[PDB]
From a paper:
Eph receptors constitute the largest family of receptor tyrosine kinases (RTKs). In particular, EphB2 signaling regulates many developmental processes and adult tissue homeostasis. The Eph extracellular region or ectodomain (ECD) is a multidomain assembly, consisting of a ligand-binding domain (LBD), a cysteine-rich domain (CRD), and two fibronectin (FN) III domains (FN1 and FN2). Indeed, imaging studies with Eph-expressing cells have shown that, unlike the ‘canonical’ RTKs, where simply bringing two receptors close to each other is enough for signaling, the Eph receptors require the formation of higher-order assemblies or clusters, for full biological activity.
The protein was crystallized in 1.1 M Na Succinate, 0.1 M Na Acetate pH 4.8, 5% (v/v) MPD, and 3% 1, 6-Hexanediol, and the structure was determined by molecular replacement at 3.1 Å resolution with a final R-free of 25%. Overall, the protein shows an extended, elongated architecture (~150 Å long and 25–50 Å wide) with all four domains well ordered. As in previously published Eph–ECD structures, the region containing the LBD, the CRD, and FN1 is rigid, but the connection between FN1 and FN2 is flexible. The EphB2 protein is glycosylated at four sites: N265, N336, N428, and N482, as illustrated. As in some of the previously reported unliganded Eph ectodomain structures, the EphB2–ECD forms homotypic head-to-tail dimers via interactions between the LBD and the FNIII domains of two neighboring molecules. The size of the LBD–FN interface is 1103 Å2 and the specific interacting residues are listed in Figure 2B. For example, the FN C-terminal ‘tail’ (FN1-FN2) of one EphB2 molecule wraps around the LBD ‘head’ of the other molecule, covering several residues beyond the LBD and the FN2 domains. In EphB2, in addition to the 13 LBD and 10 FN2 residues, there are 12 residues within the CRD (including Ile-291, Asn-292, Arg-294, and Thr-295) and three residues within the FN1 (Arg-348, Arg-392, and Tyr-394) that participate in the head-to-tail interactions. Interestingly, the glycosylated Asn-482 in the FN2 domain is in the heart of the head-to-tail interface, revealing its important role in the homotypic Eph–Eph interactions. As illustrated on Figure 2A, the Asn-482-attached glycan wraps around the connection between the LBD and CRD of the interacting molecule, locking in place the LBD and CRD of one Eph molecule against the FN1–FN2 region of its neighbor.
Numbering used by the authors: 19 to 543
Write the structure that this text describes.
């Protein structure tokens, strides 16, 4: 970024530059490269001998600059072109500067020689130029920049020296260079003026942007002479609850539905399932009411809840020993840390208040924290009634203000299994089904709850069998082959347990033709 301390082409009416001697430089109206009409200076005392012609600019405010740049546009007539020119002819001019705190210059001060002044360089027409048409004849306009520093006083003058040439100084622009305010690696680096030396790299310190915090230190950026910042050093990062936006220029609060817990430039991630943001810019998602997240739980994981009760409690009692199996709860709470607890309630044979179970009762594998849906129960009071409660508990249960969901079974020791079921008859049949029924076993020995039926193809074996559960003593079996003989065995279930499978009974589906006859009679639908 360049800041102009003086521009000769902004001259409204006339530049006030001092000419010494007046014999030399003269001010003349001219054109710029775009043919806009400006003020220029010229000197062509080529034949005259021993010429030292000086042109001094007005006072120029430094305005805090450190290295000053002077850009010069000009044209020179080549001494070859001038007929019968002496060897005094030159195609160069010299640039000088004088530093001062106040515009105290006269026609005699400072002295018009090299030393009160300071030489920048000898300027010549060298390969950097443009060509502009004027009225069919083209003019060559050279542009040359020079720089000088350090500069310390409030201002300075520039001086131009001719020593016997034909030249036209068209424009002079004086400027310094600054580096603009920038945001890099999360930091605001403020305006920095370029340094005095040509190769200067000036250092500036970064401060974190808005809702951001320093992460890697130190935070530094460097400004070069051409007005450009270099590669950054250090880093600021958007703090928790804030995400980097607008090519890293702002750190913005996390939008609703999103959270961020640790510092970073990354973007906020959505609240896990069954969680929500109380507000914007959230460091955490609050779990849904009745739902909790556990310690040691990944925070990407959804909020979870307690499991429901176990179901399908099936009990088989062998004398004082017992076996309880079941199937897992309908709702597992979203967790895989689900385990079962068994609580025992020894109770009177009648409606007397239940008592605590004995110390002697043995639980294999254990009373609590069961992994499989089954418990094998050892020594227990014989001919005694009891209630067993199997509760389901998962890894978030300890946060629940409610008691665990459980399943209950009332059962009595040394109770007899139902007798084997007598016989079964085929009620109806189709090509793919067999509907059949059987009699209640003659000696239930308790209340019967459900039945079990096992079927397999006669050509195949019990190895290939299937088993199903029947709430009543009649049921349909579907999916069978056409005209095939199937072997059926049935078993009853009381709280005490299962009976013995009945004798293998042999039924058969309709063949395809028999089913054709049946449906043909049934016509129409
Ligand atoms: C009904 O159940 C029986 C027994 O479970 C099944 O028979 C078994 O079928 C498998 C292939 O499905 C047989 O394994 C095969 O063994 C031969 C060598 O004999 C080998 O070349 C094959 O790559 C394959 O490993 C197995 O031997 C056989 N077992 C018996 C005792 O026969 C039968 O597939 C089941 N059918 C249905 C419809 O479910
Ligand atoms: C399992 O046994 C318990 C024994 O405590 C039974 O509990 C009683 O249930 C009746 C049901 O109306 C209540 O009126 C009683 O107050 C309960 N307490 C007692 C001490 O008897 C329970 O009903 C039995 N469950 C089944 C399905 O038989
Ligand atoms: C961010 O960078 C992309 C790069 O293609 C540019 O198109 C966009 O204008 C930049 N936005 C801002 C605010 O600088
Ligand atoms: C019950 O357990 C005994 C061992 O204590 C075992 O011999 C018997 O086969 C089991 N089953 C029945 C129905 O008794």
């Amino acid at each position: 970024v360049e800041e102009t301390l003086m521009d000769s082409t902004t001259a409204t009416a006339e530049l006030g530059w001092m000419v010494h001697p007046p014999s030399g430089w003269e001010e003349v109206s001219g054109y710029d490269e775009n043919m806009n009409t400006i003020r220029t200076y010229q000197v062509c005392n080529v034949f005259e001998s021993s010429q030292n012609n000086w042109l001094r600019t007005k006072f120029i405010r430094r305005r805090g600059a450190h290295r000053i740049h002077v850009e010069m546009k000009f044209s020179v007539r080549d001494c070859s072109s001038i007929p019968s020119v002496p060897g005094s002819c030159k195609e160069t001019f010299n640039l000088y500067y004088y530093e001062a705190d106040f515009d105290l210059a006269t026609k005699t001060f400072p002295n018009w020689m090299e030393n009160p002044w300071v030489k920048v360089d000898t300027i010549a027409a060298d390969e950097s130029f443009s060509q502009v048409d004027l009225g069919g004849r083209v003019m060559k306009i050279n542009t040359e920049v020079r720089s000088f520093g350090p500069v310390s006083r409030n201002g300075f003058y520039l001086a131009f020296q001719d020593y016997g040439g034909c030249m036209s100084l068209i424009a002079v622009r004086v400027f310094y260079r600054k580096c603009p305010r920038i945001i890099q690696n999360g930091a605001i680096f403020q305006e920095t003026l370029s340094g005095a030396e040509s190769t200067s790299l000036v250092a500036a310190r970064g401060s974190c942007i808005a809702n951001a915090e320093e992460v890697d230190v130190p935070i530094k950026l460097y400004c070069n002479g051409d007005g450009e910042w270099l590669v950054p050093i250090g880093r600021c990062m958007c703090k928790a609850g804030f995400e980097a936006v607008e090519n890293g220029t702002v750190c913005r609060g996390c939008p609703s539905g999103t959270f961020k817990a640790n510092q970073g430039d990354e973007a906020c991630t959505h609240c896990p399932i069954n969680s929500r943001t109380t507000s914007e810019g959230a460091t955490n998602c609050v779990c849904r009411n009745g739902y909790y997240r556990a310690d040691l739980d990944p925070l990407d994981m959804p909020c979870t809840t307690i499991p429901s009760a176990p179901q399908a409690v099936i009990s088989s009692v062998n004398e004082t020993s017992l076996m309880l199996e079941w199937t897992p709860p309908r709702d597992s709470g979203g967790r895989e840390d689900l385990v079962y607890n068994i609580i025992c309630k020894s109770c009177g044979s009648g409606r007397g208040a239940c008592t605590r179970c004995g110390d002697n009762v043995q639980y294999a594998p254990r009373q609590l924290g069961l992994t499989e849906p089954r418990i094998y129960i050892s020594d227990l009071l014989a001919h005694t009634q009891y209630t067993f409660e199997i509760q389901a508990v998962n890894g978030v249960t300890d946060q629940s203000p409610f008691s665990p969901q459980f399943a209950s079974v009332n059962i009595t020791t040394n109770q007899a299994a139902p007798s084997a079921v007598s016989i079964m008859h085929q009620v109806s049949r189709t090509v793919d089904s067999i509907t059949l029924s059987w009699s209640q076993p003659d000696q239930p020995n308790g209340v019967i709850l459900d039945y079990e039926l096992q079927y397999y193809e006669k050509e195949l074996s019990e190895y290939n069998a299937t088993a199903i559960k029947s709430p009543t003593n009649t049921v349909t079996v579907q999916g069978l082959k056409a005209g095939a003989i199937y072997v059926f065995q049935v078993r009853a279930r009381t709280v005490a347990g299962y009976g013995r499978y009945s004798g293998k009974m042999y039924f058969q589906t309709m063949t395809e033709a028999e089913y054709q006859t049946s449906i043909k009679e049934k016509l129409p639908l």
